[PDB]
Every structure is written in structure tokens, then in C-alpha cells.
């Protein structure tokens with residue numbers, strides 16, 4: 694049950710996504726870039742990602758671990774850095790702040806999960 698629960702990350706990620714949706718800094722990243730509206734986005738970005746898509750992937754059970762979820766979130770930020778590379782851009786600054794917030798909060802989720810894995814493997 695509760696110590697080393699290998700499923701506890703799911704609720705922890707739901708809670709973190711809730712915080713992220715509350716942040717004004719997430720506003721550009723909540724929904725997919727409108728590919729019909731914004732022409733050259735696909736010329737630049739191979740794999741779009743956004744927080745609504747991550748939140749639905751989680752709700753759907755399609756992440757095997759919090760590291761898979763983290764990979765998709767990191768793609769949100771790497772896509773922004775590629776599309777909006779200037780340190781002068783306020784959008785760049787938003788992405789930087791929100792990335793730092795995410796990386797701060799996800800740290801403990803991943804470490805806790807990996808510790809759970811190691812314990813269960815050791816005692817299996």
C-alpha cells in the first residue's frame with residue numbers, strides 16, 4: 694500500500710498539471726498551436742505538444758511512468774525554444790519561468806518513483 698506505491702505518481706502529476714494550468718505563464722502552452730491558423734509552425738517544429746494533450750494522455754492511461762510524462766512536457770519547452778529562440782521575447786521568458794517551475798516540482802515525483810522501483814525490484 695502507501696510507502697513505495699508505484700502508482701502514486703499519477704495523482705501527483707494530475708496535481709502538478711493543475712498548478713501549471715493556473716499559472717499565467719502557461720497560457721501560450723495550454724492548447725495545441727493552431728496549425729490551420731499559424732502557417733510556418735510545422736515548417737519548424739517536428740512534434741507539437743501542449744499541456745492539454747499531456748493532461749489527456751495521462752487521464753487516458755497512456756504514460757507508463759512519470760519519466761514518459763516528463764519527456765512530453767520537456768518537448769513543450771524545447772519546441773518553444775526552437776520557435777521562439779530570442780532571450781528578448783517575452784514568450785521566451787514565459788517558457789523559461791514555467792520550465793523552471795515544472796523542473797522544480799517534477800524532481801521529487803521522479804526520485805520517489807525511481808526509489809519505489811528499486812525497492813520492489815530488490816525484494817521481488
Ligand SMILES: CC(=O)NCc1c(Cl)cccc1Cl
Nearest residue numbers: 721722726731734773776784
Ligand atoms: C506555443 C507557441 O510557441 N506560440 C508562439 C506563437 C505566438 Cl506567441 C503567436 C502566434 C503563433 C505562435 Cl505559434
